[PDB]
Swiss-Prot record, chain A:
Keyword DNA-binding belongs to the record: yes
Protein's name according to its UniProt entry: CRISPR-associated endonuclease Cas1
Cross-referenced InterPro entries: CRISPR-assoc_Cas1, CRISPR-assoc_Cas1_C, CRISPR-assoc_Cas1_HMARI/TNEAP, CRISPR-assoc_Cas1_N
Lineage: Archaea, Methanobacteriati, Methanobacteriota, Thermococci, Thermococcales
Physiological role: CRISPR (clustered regularly interspaced short palindromic repeat), is an adaptive immune system that provides protection against mobile genetic elements (viruses, transposable elements and conjugative plasmids). CRISPR clusters contain spacers, sequences complementary to antecedent mobile elements, and target invading nucleic acids. CRISPR clusters are transcribed and processed into CRISPR RNA (crRNA). Acts as a dsDNA endonuclease. Involved in the integration of spacer DNA into the CRISPR cassette.
Summary of subunit composition and partner proteins: Homodimer, forms a heterotetramer with a Cas2 homodimer.
Family the entry assigns: Belongs to the CRISPR-associated endonuclease Cas1 family.
KW rRNA-binding (keyword) present: no
MF annotations from Gene Ontology: DNA binding; DNA endonuclease activity; metal ion binding
Chain positions recorded as Mn(2+) binding sites: E147, H212, E227
HAMAP family linked to this entry: Cas1
From Swiss-Prot, chain B:
InterPro entries cross-referenced by the UniProt entry: CRISPR-assoc_Cas1, CRISPR-assoc_Cas1_C, CRISPR-assoc_Cas1_HMARI/TNEAP, CRISPR-assoc_Cas1_N
Function: CRISPR (clustered regularly interspaced short palindromic repeat), is an adaptive immune system that provides protection against mobile genetic elements (viruses, transposable elements and conjugative plasmids). CRISPR clusters contain spacers, sequences complementary to antecedent mobile elements, and target invading nucleic acids. CRISPR clusters are transcribed and processed into CRISPR RNA (crRNA). Acts as a dsDNA endonuclease. Involved in the integration of spacer DNA into the CRISPR cassette.
Stored HAMAP family: Cas1 (MF_01470)
Gene this protein is translated from: cas1
Cofactor(s) demanded: Mg(2+); Mn(2+)
Family: Belongs to the CRISPR-associated endonuclease Cas1 family.
GO molecular function, one term: metal ion binding
UniProt-listed GO biological process terms: defense response to virus; maintenance of CRISPR repeat elements
Top-level taxon of the source organism: Archaea
Name of the protein in question: CRISPR-associated endonuclease Cas1
Source organism per UniProt: Pyrococcus horikoshii (strain ATCC 700860 / DSM 12428 / JCM 9974 / NBRC 100139 / OT-3)
Amino acid sequence: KKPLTIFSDGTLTRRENTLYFESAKGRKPLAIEGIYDIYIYGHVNITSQALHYIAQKGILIHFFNHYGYYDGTFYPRETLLSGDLIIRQAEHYLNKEKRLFLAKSFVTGGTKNMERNLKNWGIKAKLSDYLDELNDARKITEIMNVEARIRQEYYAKWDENLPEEFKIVKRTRRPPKNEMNALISFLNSRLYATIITEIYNTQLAPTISYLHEPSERRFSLSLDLSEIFKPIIADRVANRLVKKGSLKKEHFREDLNGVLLTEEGMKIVTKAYNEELQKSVKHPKIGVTRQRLIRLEAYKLIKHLVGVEEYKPLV
Amino acid sequence: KPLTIFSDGTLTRRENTLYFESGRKPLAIEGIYDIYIYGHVNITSQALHYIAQKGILIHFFNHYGYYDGTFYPRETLLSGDLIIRQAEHYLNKEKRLFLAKSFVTGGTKNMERNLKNWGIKAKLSDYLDELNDARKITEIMNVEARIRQEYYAKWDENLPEEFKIVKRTRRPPKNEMNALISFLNSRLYATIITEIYNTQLAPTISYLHEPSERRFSLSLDLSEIFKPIIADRVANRLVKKGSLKKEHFREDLNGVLLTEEGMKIVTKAYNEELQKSVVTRQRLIRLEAYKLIKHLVGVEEYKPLVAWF
Ligand SMILES: [Cl-]
Ligand SMILES: [Cl-]
């Protein structure tokens, strides 16, 4: 079961028990047994029959900007619903100390994975210096504010290892001002959807977060986990793409608003990201897919919420 | 209130403006925060990005109320998580007890209204005194069980022997009437789940019933009230008006069930009851849900519905 990604324009339809994508060249069937989540970068129309069909199969649909920024998601009715786990989730938010621990854990994890990135790329960092701020803090806002500076410095330390063309200077998001900002925005937008998909495969309610504020209109928990997995996946993908030379100036375009990837660039980056998502690890002593890790992080969290195993963030 | 679309067509962006095609009609979304689709509606990427930009949620439904899913845009409007308040009223024992008691109270009263309407001398209210002094949920449920048992046993006075309940039987049923009530209860279960999905309430969190079956426990809580109002009434009219005879039931290897003919008959009667007005029976369910939500945010204390018709 693999992620479906659609750059072309057309219409998703249901011709009975098969799902089709009609374009110029027209009706091509889709094996929906093998489809896990869907990603829409093209201008694509979806019929009610299709959407019903995709919903019936518990498949998520992810929608994106014209320059490939995350737009939104179609979330089908939950299959793995569990009434008690939800209550434990909410109990760890309602209790302030419990919330503080998790909120701190996410930022700790992000900071450590970030400095491991810098350590691996041979940049002297010691972002760890900032952890003292984090762990003695009593309010969530100041915690998040520290995480912001840490991220801000990490980029600026990453720029030392980057050529002027692909240097970050300010993180500029929607919309970018840089080839590198464009790249990172695109990759972060992929990662967000990926984490939402993996959360839908658990009994966790995706709206309840600890670091970020819960909203019934927002998958905030995915934002909580993206703290950890931005460093591990997205940043690495960006770095390898820029440094090995898969992306040149040719794959970027300038308009009045910002800088963006060409369709070619988007496809290159999409494949590299998917290629990292299936790249497997070796814990040098225990002797697993990057995506598996995401779901494992979710399971770690669940074991914490039922008081079984205290939550240590992935490093 | 939010936008709801029963008609069939296609949502489009002509060019910065939202339209419904089939015939081009524009849409004023300025005061709108969520959209509800009950019709067969197609949505263009341009439309969907336009909706996403304004931070509007789209909720999707079959014509018969099958919940499909929700589009959650990236753009977030300021809100709060209702689920947390839901869970807060479970985690707090006193709060849970109040609601748990409310559901059973409601059920008991609607049941007694049923018996009053069918001219059966009841006084189920007698049992409410047990209810309000109880401190554990199991005991509350046991009382509700007693009340249900007696209500059935007095309902039997008004029924012919063929369609008499004797024991409530469920896994599986032993009777044509048990079969009927089980079927109608399942239909009602789905209906209440549908109406719940049209709110922001999480359907798994209940108070009377345990969450930890992990399957729409809240629907069971509200079914306490609406079983009497809808399901039982439909059953009563079906058996006595004579729409269901023995022919519509079958004995199976284990238990008793409706034929496809029977299921269709019962389905039509139930659906027609849902649109019968006093404000239709279906609206009342959603109104109950809104009452519950107003309770959960400390605005209005929750009084259970008691049918006056
Ligand atoms: Cl705070
Ligand atoms: Cl029952």
